[PDB]
Design a protein around this ligand. Structure first.
Ligand SMILES: COc1ccc(C2(C3=Cc4cc(N5CCN(C)CC5)ccc4C4=NCCN34)CC2)cc1
Length: 300
């Protein structure tokens, strides 16, 4: 991990970057801020190229669409709490998700949004904005404090609150046992495995394949090729502590532990898996205000 670039939010006395994603436009990083702004930065110059106020509370999450035409945002205490923005030609709001505190695109064909409201998942059509489907069963809930509903790579399964759902039938096919209080789980890009905190389950047999103690309380991100898994750990200001782990995605063998000595707010990779971007806070949890920097590292 060779540091190649660093920047702080332009002009600000304290720098308020909260989350990041690379744009479909080569060289440009998208960042959310603690004032609900979306900014476009040259990742090498640190030049601010554009600024849009999406929310009147802090951004917690953003996800660009692969074809660069759409963006999802989530905020902290705004109504609406999440939104879908059009980026082709003029930046504008397309739909709003009144109480969903987290949203993602479908993965295969990006024509749907999945939103999370506490223990409940909602699926929406992108063209009409209509809610197609609500996945919730109170007998099956795990009540994960950081529940995030997600699609599998083919868009026909959903993981919500540690329940695996068939999207076509709207049927719960399996409730995974609850072994932590916060992390609800993600699909591996290979479409055969589920990662729920420290447990790696097989989707076809529900055997436990691996225990990875180092993933405890970690939020997991895959590189674009599905060969490396990157993890940063939640705080018992900041959602994460000050270090990140890399794992081999095929055997879950640890490759690296990096302590950046600063609390991490977010990290993401470019679609060619050359660069890792990390939002690190220079201030503590106790400071008046946050003071984040975006650090760009070369990996290979
Ligand atoms: C499964 O585990 C997860 C843990 C956290 C999250 C979320 C999330 C929340 C968040 C709040 C921030 N705060 C700082 C203090 N300020 C007062 C208000 C805003 C700053 C960054 C982030 C953030 N960045 C990337 C993810 N994420 C909601 C998405 C998702 C999953």
């Amino acid at each position: 991990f060779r540091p190649i670039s660093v920047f702080r939010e332009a002009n600000e006395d304290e720098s308020g970057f909260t989350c990041c994603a690379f744009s479909a436009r080569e060289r440009f990083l998208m960042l959310g801020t603690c004032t609900g702004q979306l900014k476009l930065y040259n990742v090498f110059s640190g030049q601010e190229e554009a600024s849009y106020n999406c929310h009147n509370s802090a951004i917690t999450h953003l996800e660009p669409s692969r074809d660069g035409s759409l963006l999802l945002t989530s905020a902290t205490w705004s109504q609406p709490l999440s939104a879908l923005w059009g980026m082709k030609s003029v930046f504008d709001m397309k739909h709003s998700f009144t109480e969903d505190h987290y949203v993602e695109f479908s993965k295969h064909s990006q024509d749907r949004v999945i939103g999370t409201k506490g223990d409940i998942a909602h699926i929406y059509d992108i063209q009409t904005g209509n809610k197609l489907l609500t996945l919730f069963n109170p007998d099956l809930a795990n009540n994960y404090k950081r529940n995030c509903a997600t699609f599998n790579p083919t868009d026909d399964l959903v993981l919500n609150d540690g329940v695996l759902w068939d999207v076509r039938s709207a049927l719960a096919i399996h409730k995974f046992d609850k072994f932590n209080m916060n992390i609800s789980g993600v699909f591996h890009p290979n479409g055969l495995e589920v990662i729920i905190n420290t447990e790696i389950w097989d989707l076809r047999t529900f055997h436990l394949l691996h225990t990875v103690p180092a993933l405890d309380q970690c939020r997991v991100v895959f590189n674009h090729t599905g060969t490396v898994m990157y993890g940063a750990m939640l705080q018992a200001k900041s959602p994460f502590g000050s270090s990140f782990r890399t794992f081999n995605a095929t055997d879950y063998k640890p490759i690296a532990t990096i302590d950046v000595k600063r609390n991490i707010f977010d990290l993401c990779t470019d679609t060619k898996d050359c660069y890792l971007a990390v939002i690190e806070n220079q201030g503590s949890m106790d400071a008046l205000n946050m003071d984040t920097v975006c650090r760009l590292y070369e990996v290979g």
